[PDB]
Symmetry: C3
């Protein structure tokens, strides 16, 4: 798969997703929502979409990743929406692993107004 | 796919999911969960289920979608389970987009007790 | 597929996923994040991965169910990660339904530096 940027890592065949990296150091206040830059662009194969999902490693710190849908046609850089649900401030370091990207098949169908 | 209602919109081939509109206005206090009606009933094709995932514009506001799994065998009105995990109250308006519906392939296996 | 445990239940063919039950009783203090054991091991078919989606019911109960990816290669016990987002402790009871597991296909490819 064609990509641009270095905020993503190759994966084992036995793994479902690619690790996504935080482009820069981020500071999340309590309850704050942030869109974390990864610095990568993707060219997904025709017929598939990218699923941004969290890693147990950072989830276990009170950081939730909000469902991420990457469209086959998206050409901009990937961003990870993250909320700090803890009562204290949290800091993500540069290049730290923040989420996963899973490539799944997507079905296309026109909508008929039936019963 | 056969649908009934107008709380869902068609999509481009480069799109992954069909946007879901809110059928009515919803007010969610911080930490509140509510099912948002869409008024759309649909017939999932054979061998596929539908996954509901939030959109970036709403997610970026502290809103998440809980258990958005639409079964191949389900013909009721689609409702979106939304939770406000932000520190303040947000208001969603009628006809406003709230989620997306991505159709994915089912996979049926028989569970067999055994050594792993 | 080959399973080893009690925490899972067979599904109808029109059902997208299998129910996961809580292995034991768990106390989640206010604001605590815990891994709820299920006591099941898997041998996911080749090429597929397991998606864990929380049960709506438990999200309305002050609990938030996090990242759920069971890798093809993963041979350990399945656990469900959650955080107590309320002001009081919440106990989960044994054999209580806490989420669903859905088997989905997976695409593997080498990452190639190019221009998008
Ligand atoms: O909700 C979850 C998340 C992960 N796992 C398990 O952990 C394996 C290990 O994932 P890993 O060691 O990469 O760490 P992570 O990316 O989850 O932080 C997965 O295949 C499985 C699990 O049982 N439930
Ligand atoms: O976690 C996410 C979710 C979305 N995107 C981007 O958003 C496109 C779609 O944004 P969306 O469909 O939500 O539009 P909105 O309704 O939010 O204006 C994707 O191709 C990309 C992203 O980078 N990360």
């Amino acid at each position: 798969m064609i990509i641009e940027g270095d905020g993503i890592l190759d994966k084992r065949s036995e793994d479902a997703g690619y690790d996504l990296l935080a482009a820069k150091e981020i500071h999340l206040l309590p309850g704050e929502v942030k869109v974390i830059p990864t610095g990568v662009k993707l060219m997904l194969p025709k017929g598939y979409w990218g699923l941004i999902i969290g890693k147990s490693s950072i989830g276990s710190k009170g950081l939730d990743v909000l469902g991420g849908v990457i469209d086959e046609g998206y050409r901009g850089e990937i961003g990870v929406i993250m909320i700090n649900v803890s009562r204290k401030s949290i800091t993500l370091m540069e290049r730290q692993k923040i989420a996963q990207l899973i490539i799944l098949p997507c079905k296309h169908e026109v909508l008929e107004q039936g019963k």
